[PDB]
Amino acid sequence: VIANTNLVTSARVRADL
Amino acid sequence: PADQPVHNYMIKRLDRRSLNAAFSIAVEALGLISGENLDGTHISSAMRL
């Protein structure tokens, strides 16, 4: 996200493990 | 004896020229303008301005 200077103060795949 | 009202006739030619000027635009800033992929926040960013 690109904010200006303003300020506050799944799936099931096949794999080997 | 009197005089008659004389007049003349002139034929002129149109000489043609043409001017030209040019600029460019940077490939990096091309899709930033017309690109409608930017959905929610980049449409009002600072670099777009």
Side-chain angles (χ1 to χ4, degrees):
Chain A
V1 309
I2 296 176
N4 64 306
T5 192
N6 74 102
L7 76 163
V8 296
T9 42
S10 45
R12 177 71 68 91
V13 309
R14 207 145 292 135
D16 307 59
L17 302 187
Chain B
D3 45 355
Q4 285 68 23
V6 285
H7 50 89
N8 310 307
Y9 286 93
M10 317 287 185
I11 321 165
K12 305 305 196 66
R13 181 172 300 256
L14 274 298
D15 306 71
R16 176 187 328 281
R17 302 134 173 275
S18 158
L19 313 192
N20 58 5
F23 63 92
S24 164
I25 180 175
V27 64
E28 293 159 307
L30 298 202
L32 206 168
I33 308 190
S34 197
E36 319 288 349
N37 309 321
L38 318 179
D39 41 358
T41 302
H42 317 260
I43 57 186
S44 177
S45 87
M47 292 79 69
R48 194 174 185 170
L49 171 151

